[PDB]
Amino acid sequence: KLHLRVVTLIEHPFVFTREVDDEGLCPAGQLCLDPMTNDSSMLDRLFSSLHSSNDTVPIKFKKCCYGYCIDLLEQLAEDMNFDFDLYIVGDGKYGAWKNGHWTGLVGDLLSGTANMAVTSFSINTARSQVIDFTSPFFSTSLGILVRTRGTELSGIHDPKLHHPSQGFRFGTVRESSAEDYVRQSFPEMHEYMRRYNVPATPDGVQYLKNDPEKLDAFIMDKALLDYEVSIDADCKLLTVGKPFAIEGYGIGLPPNSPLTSNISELISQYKSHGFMDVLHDKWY
């Protein structure tokens, strides 16, 4: 039985977290750590302390993880007969090339801090040069979230984005695939957005949705924005414009991992036997 350490990132409805229950258990999900570290030795020590008969892990690090990607991970673990430790990425980022290294999930796979990454993780060309991805389990365009009766946009080529009016505020999630697409296709746009980008999806959604309104538009994976629109109780939000920058979501592994092809085979069996449809129905 193989023993993997899996890194994840909280992103609804793919991965959610909540506090652990009265007995320190997670009936509806998976026990995970949120330790704010990229140090493999620190993670070794914490998981060791978690599994032993004298668990001294700071309570604030213990969480229960659940969601579409957690259900997928549990099925994979059963079918491939591995067990796993699960932790949330310390910097909260998917990963970008910054200051001569990869951050986020990508950085943890390249440093050996994690054996596998499971979340709403986009397969793009830059990441594919340095880590392995499995076959995709989901596919999404990038999207543009605006308020109803607010900013109107045709898509990523709208002149309002390329020649912004004074006070026009739009941004994406820092160190995301979305930010890399803008950086590489529209460098001037990327520069303009820097002061408006946010650390994580919920922040952009809150900045656009709630008052006081801090963003006029928010660019991020459409699958994530559509989930937020679907739970909007007040006809306040919508996604606008033509599709752009479509990418799959895949599981991330170190380059040339022997596990990649076996996980890909199972993802293809799950797709072709309706399991992905069950997960979509459960979480969307």
Under the binding rule (CB under 8 A), the answer on residue 189 touching a copy of itself is: no
- Length of the chain measured in residues: 284
Under the binding rule (CB under 8 A), the answer on residue 112 touching a copy of itself is: no
Under the binding rule (CB under 8 A), the answer on residue 108 touching a copy of itself is: no
- Element at 178 (helix H, strand E): helix 177-185
Task: Name the minimum Å distance from CB 125 to a copy of itself.
Answer: 5
- Asked if 176 and 105 touch (Cβ cutoff 8 Å), the reply is no
Omega prior to 212 cis, within 30 of 0: yes
- Which CB atom, from 65 or from 198, has the smaller least distance to Cl ion? 65
Quickly count: other Cβ atoms within 10 Å of residue 163's Cβ.
Answer: 10
Q: Kindly identify the residues of this chain, within the stretch 205-244, that bind a copy of itself according to CB under 8 A.
A: 242-244
- Which CB atom, from 103 or from 122, has the smaller least distance to Cl ion? 122
The three-class DSSP label of residue 278 is helix
Q: Kindly identify the residues of this chain, within the stretch 50-69, that bind Cl ion according to CB under 5 A.
A: 64
Quickly count: other Cβ atoms within 10 Å of residue 34's Cβ.
Answer: 18
Number of H helices, E strands in the chain: 11, 15
- Which CB atom, from 36 or from 276, has the smaller least distance to a copy of itself? 276
- Which CB atom, from 211 or from 281, has the smaller least distance to a copy of itself? 281
- The mark string for 184-223 relative to Cl ion (x by CB under 5 A, - otherwise) is ----------------------------------------
- Element at 248 (helix H, strand E): strand 244-249
Applying CB under 8 A, the residues found at the interface with a copy of itself are: 123, 125, 128-129, 133, 135-136, 139, 141, 155-157, 184-185, 242-248, 268, 271-274, 276-277
Which residue ranges make up the site for Cl ion (CB under 5 A)?
A: 26, 28-29, 64, 136, 139
